[PDB]
Amino acid sequence: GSLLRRAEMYQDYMKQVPIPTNRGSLIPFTSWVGLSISMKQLYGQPLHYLTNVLLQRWDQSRFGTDSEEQRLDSIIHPTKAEATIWLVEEIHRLTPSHLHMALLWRSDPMYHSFIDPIFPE
């Protein structure tokens, strides 16, 4: 039963945050985490634990490349990138159980580092 109270409160909160229907202009970016910070600044909403973990994994995945350094937004267009993040965020708001979240957090000693603070409102 470890972490069940906080997982339930967390998922109950995130499932109720609406995905913005009105979008801004394209956001230049050089990392997925960077793009997510821009989105949090501009739209003033948190992103889900599962989104923050996924974006960090996408950034980590680029390391070790044989290619020369290249801006991420020269590979994935910012409009598509932001759309991707809102799509995965909607999945993570609407589908996972709080039991599943508690199970992940039991195995992730740093889980709190992927949970956003409360935003104004």
UniProtKB/Swiss-Prot annotation:
It comes from the Eukaryota. Keywords: DNA-binding, Nucleus. One of its GO terms (molecular function) is DNA binding. The keyword Nucleus applies. Changing residue 9 to A: Decreased binding to single-stranded methyl DNA. One of its GO terms (biological process) is gene silencing by siRNA-directed DNA methylation. Disruption phenotype: Impaired accumulation of siRNAs, reduced DNA methylation, and loss of transcriptional gene silencing at RdDM target loci. Impaired RNA polymerase V-chromatin associations (Pol V). It is found in: Nucleus, Nucleoplasm. GO terms for cellular component: nucleoplasm; nucleus; RNA polymerase V complex. Homodimer. Interacts with AGO4, RPB205 and DRM2. Part of the chromatin-remodeling complex (DDR complex) that contains at least DRD1, DMS3 and RDM1. The DDR complex recruits/activates the RNA polymerases V and acts during siRNA-directed DNA methylation (RdDM). Regulator of RNA-directed DNA methylation (RdDM). Binds to single-stranded methyl DNA. Involved in the assembly of RNA polymerase V (Pol V) transcription initiation or elongation complexes at the chromatin, as a component of the DDR complex. This is Protein RDM1. It comes from Arabidopsis thaliana. The lineage of its organism: Eukaryota, Viridiplantae, Streptophyta, Embryophyta, Tracheophyta. The gene is RDM1. The chain holds residues 42 to 162 of 163 of the full protein.
